[PDB]
Every structure is written in structure tokens, then in C-alpha cells.
Amino acid sequence: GAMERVLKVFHYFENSSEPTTWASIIRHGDATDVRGIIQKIVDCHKVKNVACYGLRLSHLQSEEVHWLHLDMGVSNVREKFELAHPPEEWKYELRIRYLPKGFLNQFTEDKPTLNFFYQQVKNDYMLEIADQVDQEIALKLGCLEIRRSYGEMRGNALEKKSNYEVLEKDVGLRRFFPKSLLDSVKAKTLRKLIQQTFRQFANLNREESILKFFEILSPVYRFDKECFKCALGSSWIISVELAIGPEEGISYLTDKGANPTHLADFNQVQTIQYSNSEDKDRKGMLQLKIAGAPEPLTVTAPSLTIAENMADLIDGYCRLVNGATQSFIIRPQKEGERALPSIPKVSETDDYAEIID
């Protein structure tokens, strides 16, 4: 629009508000790209690992997700998805998506990022598995968040009923523990289990609490890779599940619980070329030219949305491991080749992004 260019971006940089509420309001221009939106948010929190962050668009009433590539124009994206469904039904969310090898060690030297990643993974934990994990695991993770959140509290404070009551009655234990834990244990017993569990973590500082949380969660929940149902090959097409992450590089899965089988490291990917089959129901294809392999790795995704999301992921990792700011995706030249959509074809410039605090 003209004055409709105000974008709300939800994020995981903590403040005193409601977590479901953490967001920045950004006024942008007609030429601002995703890269500019990301940069402005993360520089405001003094992030070092800028290359880790992406922007995910989801429809509040679908499981569908759109990862917005850094070079996509904001107004282009908004106009395209506002043709599908109106503005109020979309959520734009800043997320860490491209993890360096050894990400935890690296994030320890960038506290805003370590904290953001923690809040991100905690949110997904509480939403997707906290009601199902072992109650001992849910007790410990909840106790760690208490320890981290109330950093100045003396380590034995929760032994006092009057202190525990503030968490139970005023704050709400739902902030830290799943409904199923709270609905299934008597209140007095829950109090005792919390007080006791908390003792093993009572002397941990905020960073140590965060690192302990990841240590305890990693066994029961993978938050360091994404998986895609797709198919590999150019002649014979074999259906697979790809597992993409810092430990896997690009891998494929075989048996439930077996180590993934390695295909390629991110640092061997030279180019990424996107194409669409010419079928009435067009297929999304990615060709990855891999250093040392004469044939490209060809991936056929079940939809164009999925292929675009996979391209964002793989390109993000290429940029990250090579320390590059530019994309490795190459321009379409032949029949059926495609670019990713919505790329365009002191603060009065039309790419300005400004946070409205």
C-alpha cells in the first residue's frame, strides 16, 4: 500500500510481556527485502550470528508454512499472500533456521542468540511434546526455566511456601510445565516434586540453565534438523525422507531410529537450480551441483511450496558455511527453470526498515 507497509514480526528476543506477544512492529518501504527486515530486528539486539536467522510465514488456520528467502521483497510477498487470505490470518515469525556445526558452543559467545534459540526451542517443546515426554523430564525442564527466569532468586527460596505460592497462584505453573503434569499430580505432591527437582539446578546461572535444558531435551526431541518427504533422482525417482541439519548435512533416512545416511556436506554444494515440471499439477524440482560429483543431486518435492522451503534451507546453509551474504541459487535460463518468487526485478530511501517501539 502506501501507509499499509507496517509489518508485525513475532520473535524470541525476551522482554517482560507475555511470550506469545514478543514481536516488533516495523515500518518498511516498497523495496525493503526480507534480509532488511531480519537485519534490523537482530541488530537491535546486538546479535553476532545474523546468518542463522530466517523469516517464516504461516497461515493461522493451516499447517502450511512459507520460508521467505532473504532476497524476496516484503511488499511482493505481502501482496502475493494477501491474494490467498487477508492480512489478519498470516503470522510472520523470525526464527533461527540455519545452525552452525557446534551451534551451542558458538551461541554461548552470542548471548542474545543463545537466548533466542532457547526461547524458540522451548516454545516448540511446550507446544509439541511437553504433554507427552516423561514427567521427570518435564519437571526438570520446567525447573530449569524457573532457575533461568528468576536469576537473582536465592537457590533455596522455593522451599518457602509463600514463595512457591506466588508461582502457583499468581504466575501460573503453566508458564513452565505442561497441562498434563499439573492435571495429574496432587497440588501438595507437585509442590514437593518441584522443590526437590529444583535443588539439583539451584546453583546454575542463566547460561548454564539454558545449556542444561538443551542437554535434557536433545534425547527426546530433535530441534537441530528438519526433515522432508521428497524424491531423489533424474531418471529413476526414489521416494525418501531427507534429514537436513548441522550434524547430517544433507542425509536420507532408512529405518526408524537408524543413523541417517549421508549424501553431501553443505560446503560441497556449488549451485542450486530451481525448476518446475510442465504438468497441469506442476512439480517443484531442485538440482544441487555437488563438488566432486559429476551428476547433480536432483530432488523432487511434493509441491512448489515445499521445494521453495527446501531451497531456502539449503541456500541458507550454503551462505552460512561459506561466510557468504549472497545466494547460491542460480538464475533460470532454460525451459521450465524458475527463480524463487517475489524477488524484485538518510531514512527516506525506499528499502528503509524502522522499528516502531
Numbering used by the authors: 31 to 375, 391 to 402
Original paper wording:
Focal Adhesion Kinase (FAK) is a 125 kDa non-receptor tyrosine kinase that has multiple implications in cancer cell signaling, invasion, proliferation, and metastasis. Activation of FAK occurs not only through autophosphorylation of key residue tyrosine 397 (Y397) by FAK itself via the kinase enzyme, but also through transphosphorylation by receptor tyrosine kinases which can bind to the FAK N-terminal FERM domain directly. The proto-oncogene Src directly binds to FAK through its SH2 and SH3 domains at phosphorylated FAK Y397 and a proline-rich region in the FERM-Kinase linker, respectively. FAK also functions as an intracellular scaffolding protein through its FERM domain and C-terminal FAT domain regions where FAK forms multiple protein-protein interactions to connect oncogenic signaling pathways.
The protein crystallized in the orthorhombic space group P 212121 with two molecules per asymmetric unit. The overall conformation of the FERM molecule displays strong structural similarity with other FERM domains of ERM family members ezrin, radixin, and moesin, consisting of three subdomains (labeled F1, F2, and F3). Residues L370 and P371 of the SH3 binding motif from FERM molecule A pack into a pocket formed by residues I359, Y304, E338, M102, and H99 in between the F1 and F3 lobes of the protein. Residues 372–375 of the motif bind along the side of the F1 lobe however visibility of residues 376–390 cannot be determined. We speculate that the intramolecular interactions between the Src SH3 binding site and the FERM F1/F3 lobes may be an “autoinhibited” conformation that prevents binding of Src to FAK and therefore the full activation of FAK by phosphorylation of Y576, Y577, Y861, and Y925. Computational prediction of this pocket in our structure suggested that the Y397 region has poor druggable characteristics, contrasting previous reports.
